[PDB]
């Protein structure tokens, strides 16, 4: 029953933060993979 | 010239992994700037 404006704002910010977190982890995983494989050269 | 195929494969793999990392770094940076801009509305 909260104002649609606030509801939409909170959702959009939450979603952007989640995207950032996901990509942070994806990047960390890719770095770990590259580093592992480099030390197997 | 004296490198085995397996090592050529490993080099190609590392090169591809470094590129995946580079692209994800850019993507993450873009997500971060996006989140910063969105959080201004709070």
UniProtKB/Swiss-Prot annotation, chain A:
Range of residues in the leader sequence: none
PTM section of the record: Phosphorylated by CDK1; regulates dissociation from intermediate filaments during mitosis.
Subcellular location(s) of the protein: Cytoplasm, Cytoskeleton; Cell junction, Hemidesmosome; Cell projection, Podosome
Disulfide bonds, paired cysteine numbers: none
Tissue: Widely expressed with highest levels in muscle, heart, placenta and spinal cord.
Role: Interlinks intermediate filaments with microtubules and microfilaments and anchors intermediate filaments to desmosomes or hemidesmosomes. Could also bind muscle proteins such as actin to membrane complexes in muscle. May be involved not only in the filaments network, but also in the regulation of their dynamics. Structural component of muscle. Isoform 9 plays a major role in the maintenance of myofiber integrity.
UniProt disease annotation: Epidermolysis bullosa simplex 5C, with pyloric atresia: A form of epidermolysis bullosa, a genodermatosis characterized by recurrent blistering, fragility of the skin and mucosal epithelia, and erosions caused by minor mechanical trauma. EBS5C is an autosomal recessive disorder characterized by severe skin blistering at birth and congenital pyloric atresia. Death usually occurs in infancy.
Self-association and partners: Homodimer or homotetramer. Interacts (via actin-binding domain) with SYNE3. Interacts (via calponin-homology (CH) 1 domain) with VIM (via rod region). Interacts (via N-terminus) with DST isoform 2 (via N-terminus). Interacts with FER. Interacts with TOR1A. Interacts with ANK3. Identified in complexes that contain VIM, EZR, AHNAK, BFSP1, BFSP2, ANK2, PLEC, PRX and spectrin. Interacts with COL17A1.
Family, similarity comment: Belongs to the plakin or cytolinker family.
Domain-related comment: The N-terminus interacts with actin, the C-terminus with vimentin, desmin, GFAP, cytokeratins, lamin B; whereas both the N- and the C-terminus can bind integrin beta-4.
Protein name per UniProt: Plectin
Annotated source species: Homo sapiens
Lineage, uppermost ranks: Eukaryota, Metazoa, Chordata, Craniata, Vertebrata
Gene: PLEC
UniProtKB/Swiss-Prot annotation, chain B:
Modification after translation (UniProt): Phosphorylated by CDK1; regulates dissociation from intermediate filaments during mitosis.
Tissue specificity field: Widely expressed with highest levels in muscle, heart, placenta and spinal cord.
Cellular localization per UniProt: Cytoplasm, Cytoskeleton; Cell junction, Hemidesmosome; Cell projection, Podosome
Disease: Epidermolysis bullosa simplex 5C, with pyloric atresia: A form of epidermolysis bullosa, a genodermatosis characterized by recurrent blistering, fragility of the skin and mucosal epithelia, and erosions caused by minor mechanical trauma. EBS5C is an autosomal recessive disorder characterized by severe skin blistering at birth and congenital pyloric atresia. Death usually occurs in infancy.
Summary of subunit composition and partner proteins: Homodimer or homotetramer. Interacts (via actin-binding domain) with SYNE3. Interacts (via calponin-homology (CH) 1 domain) with VIM (via rod region). Interacts (via N-terminus) with DST isoform 2 (via N-terminus). Interacts with FER. Interacts with TOR1A. Interacts with ANK3. Identified in complexes that contain VIM, EZR, AHNAK, BFSP1, BFSP2, ANK2, PLEC, PRX and spectrin. Interacts with COL17A1.
Family (UniProt): Belongs to the plakin or cytolinker family.
Function statement: Interlinks intermediate filaments with microtubules and microfilaments and anchors intermediate filaments to desmosomes or hemidesmosomes. Could also bind muscle proteins such as actin to membrane complexes in muscle. May be involved not only in the filaments network, but also in the regulation of their dynamics. Structural component of muscle. Isoform 9 plays a major role in the maintenance of myofiber integrity.
UniProt note: domains: The N-terminus interacts with actin, the C-terminus with vimentin, desmin, GFAP, cytokeratins, lamin B; whereas both the N- and the C-terminus can bind integrin beta-4.
Protein name (record): Plectin
Parent-protein start and end of this portion: 1492 to 1530 of 4684
């Amino acid at each position: 029953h909260m104002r649609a404006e606030e509801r939409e704002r909170l959702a959009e910010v939450e979603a952007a933060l989640e995207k950032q977190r996901q990509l942070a982890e994806a990047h960390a995983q890719a770095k770990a993979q590259a580093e592992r494989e480099a030390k197997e050269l």
